[PDB]
Design an enzyme around this catalytic site. Structure first.
Site, mmCIF file in Angstrom:
data_model
loop_
_atom_site.group_PDB
_atom_site.id
_atom_site.type_symbol
_atom_site.label_atom_id
_atom_site.label_comp_id
_atom_site.label_asym_id
_atom_site.label_seq_id
_atom_site.Cartn_x
_atom_site.Cartn_y
_atom_site.Cartn_z
ATOM 1 N N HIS A 1 -63.651 18.041 27.868
ATOM 2 C CA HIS A 1 -62.550 18.484 27.497
ATOM 3 C C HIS A 1 -63.484 19.728 26.585
ATOM 4 C CE1 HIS A 1 -59.984 14.655 26.341
ATOM 5 N NE2 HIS A 1 -59.337 15.169 28.002
ATOM 6 N N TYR B 1 -53.315 5.959 29.450
ATOM 7 C CA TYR B 1 -52.555 6.221 28.116
ATOM 8 C C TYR B 1 -51.977 7.620 28.627
ATOM 9 C CZ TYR B 1 -53.457 9.729 24.490
ATOM 10 O OH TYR B 1 -53.735 11.220 24.101
ATOM 11 N N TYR C 1 -56.608 17.961 35.018
ATOM 12 C CA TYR C 1 -54.707 16.983 34.146
ATOM 13 C C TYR C 1 -54.037 17.223 35.007
ATOM 14 C CZ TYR C 1 -56.539 15.595 29.387
ATOM 15 O OH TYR C 1 -57.134 15.763 28.639
ATOM 16 N N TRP D 1 -56.483 27.600 16.720
ATOM 17 C CA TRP D 1 -57.402 27.239 17.552
ATOM 18 C C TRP D 1 -58.635 27.675 18.267
ATOM 19 C CZ3 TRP D 1 -58.152 23.215 21.035
ATOM 20 C CH2 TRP D 1 -57.932 22.280 21.048
ATOM 21 N N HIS E 1 -53.376 26.149 25.681
ATOM 22 C CA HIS E 1 -52.156 26.285 24.688
ATOM 23 C C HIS E 1 -51.181 26.326 24.467
ATOM 24 C CE1 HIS E 1 -56.157 24.178 24.005
ATOM 25 N NE2 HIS E 1 -56.802 25.563 24.576
HETATM 26 O O1 CZN Z 1 -57.569 15.162 24.792
HETATM 27 C C1 CZN Z 1 -56.815 14.491 24.782
HETATM 28 N N1 CZN Z 1 -55.729 15.457 24.463
HETATM 29 C C2 CZN Z 1 -55.535 16.686 24.008
HETATM 30 C C3 CZN Z 1 -54.210 17.423 23.562
HETATM 31 C C4 CZN Z 1 -53.963 19.127 22.882
HETATM 32 C C5 CZN Z 1 -52.796 18.932 23.211
HETATM 33 C C6 CZN Z 1 -52.343 20.246 22.481
HETATM 34 C C7 CZN Z 1 -53.732 20.982 22.504
HETATM 35 O O2 CZN Z 1 -53.385 23.027 21.813
HETATM 36 C C8 CZN Z 1 -54.555 21.217 22.749
HETATM 37 C C9 CZN Z 1 -55.119 19.743 23.584
HETATM 38 N N2 CZN Z 1 -53.405 16.703 23.628
HETATM 39 C C10 CZN Z 1 -53.314 15.380 23.673
HETATM 40 C C11 CZN Z 1 -51.827 14.820 23.776
HETATM 41 C C12 CZN Z 1 -51.478 14.232 22.242
HETATM 42 C C13 CZN Z 1 -51.179 15.288 21.475
HETATM 43 C C14 CZN Z 1 -51.488 14.226 19.933
HETATM 44 C C15 CZN Z 1 -50.956 13.360 19.900
HETATM 45 C C16 CZN Z 1 -51.761 12.355 20.637
HETATM 46 C C17 CZN Z 1 -51.253 13.313 21.994
HETATM 47 C C18 CZN Z 1 -54.223 14.887 24.128
HETATM 48 N N3 CZN Z 1 -54.815 13.465 24.504
HETATM 49 C C19 CZN Z 1 -56.049 13.034 25.023
HETATM 50 C C20 CZN Z 1 -57.003 12.528 23.962
HETATM 51 C C21 CZN Z 1 -58.222 11.961 24.258
HETATM 52 C C22 CZN Z 1 -58.692 11.460 25.512
HETATM 53 C C23 CZN Z 1 -59.748 10.967 26.359
HETATM 54 C C24 CZN Z 1 -60.939 11.251 25.665
HETATM 55 C C25 CZN Z 1 -62.366 11.473 26.208
HETATM 56 C C26 CZN Z 1 -63.345 12.093 25.077
HETATM 57 C C27 CZN Z 1 -62.846 12.861 23.937
HETATM 58 C C28 CZN Z 1 -61.792 12.608 23.218
HETATM 59 C C29 CZN Z 1 -60.842 12.283 24.561
HETATM 60 C C30 CZN Z 1 -59.117 12.251 23.969
HETATM 61 O O3 CZN Z 1 -56.250 13.319 26.152
HETATM 62 O O4 CZN Z 1 -55.239 13.733 27.090
#
Ligand code: CZN
Length: 191
Positions: free
Chosen positions: A171, A134, A186, A88, A18
């Site tokens: 996730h 993405y 990741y 968090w 985090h």
């Molecule tokens: O899971 C996703 N995240 C998680 C975070 C994250 C950030 C800080 C932290 O302490 C923990 C997690 N940030 C982004 C990126 C972001 C941040 C702010 C605004 C826009 C983008 C992000 N993107 C995701 C989005 C995502 C992608 C796929 C998914 C599939 C299933 C469920 C949920 C999903 C969510 O993928 O990496």
């Protein structure tokens, strides 16, 4: 047996995962980030990089607003690291509670909204190329090799796609519980 549903908040690897993201989000190294910045970033990506329709973008913004809101972030407030990581702990706790009760999580609601934009076919699953698009637009992954490691870690479907249900599971393990099975989700991009 497999999945881990217990939080692990004193694990330095959870705190550090985090802190990595806090630092990645704090693009100007202010030592604080706001809800205003998070929803700006979210809508910039989907509208300006990923072709979202207006309705799709608004849905996505509401999901991101609620997600960081669940971590205690608010419009017009600058959240520093200590406030961020305590918030968090509350988010992860609430999410794990919802998940155990079979109630929709904030992370799933975000996934559904994002996948409606990112999945060309709008059927709740994404190709590797769509995941690359993405994550590289957001910046959370930089290299194709790390994007490819996501598809190694996750259970991929019969069409070679990552489904929203599987990624939601991953996730939970990666962001909430430090599930060993979700390491490297990741790639090297996020420790
Ligand atoms: O899971 C996703 N995240 C998680 C975070 C994250 C950030 C800080 C932290 O302490 C923990 C997690 N940030 C982004 C990126 C972001 C941040 C702010 C605004 C826009 C983008 C992000 N993107 C995701 C989005 C995502 C992608 C796929 C998914 C599939 C299933 C469920 C949920 C999903 C969510 O993928 O990496």
């Amino acid at each position: 047996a497999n999945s881990k549903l217990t939080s692990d908040f004193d694990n330095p690897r959870w705190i550090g995962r985090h802190k990595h993201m806090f630092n990645f989000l704090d693009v100007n190294h202010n030592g604080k980030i706001s809800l205003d910045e998070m929803v700006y970033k979210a809508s910039d990506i989907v509208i300006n990089n990923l072709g979202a329709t207006p309705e799709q973008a608004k849905r996505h913004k509401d999901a991101v607003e609620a997600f960081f809101g669940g971590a205690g972030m608010k419009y017009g407030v600058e959240t520093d690291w200590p406030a961020y990581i305590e918030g968090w702990k509350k988010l992860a706790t609430d999410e794990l509670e919802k998940y155990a009760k079979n109630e929709p999580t904030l992370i799933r609601i975000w996934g559904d909204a994002l996948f409606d934009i990112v999945d060309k076919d709008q059927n709740g699953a994404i190709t590797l190329d769509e995941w690359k698009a993405y994550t590289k637009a957001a910046g959370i992954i930089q290299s194709s090799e790390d994007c490819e490691e996501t598809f190694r870690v996750c259970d991929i479907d019969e069409s070679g796609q990552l489904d929203v249900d599987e990624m939601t599971r991953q996730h939970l393990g990666f962001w909430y519980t430090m599930d060993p099975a979700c390491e490297k989700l990741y790639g090297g991009a996020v420790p």
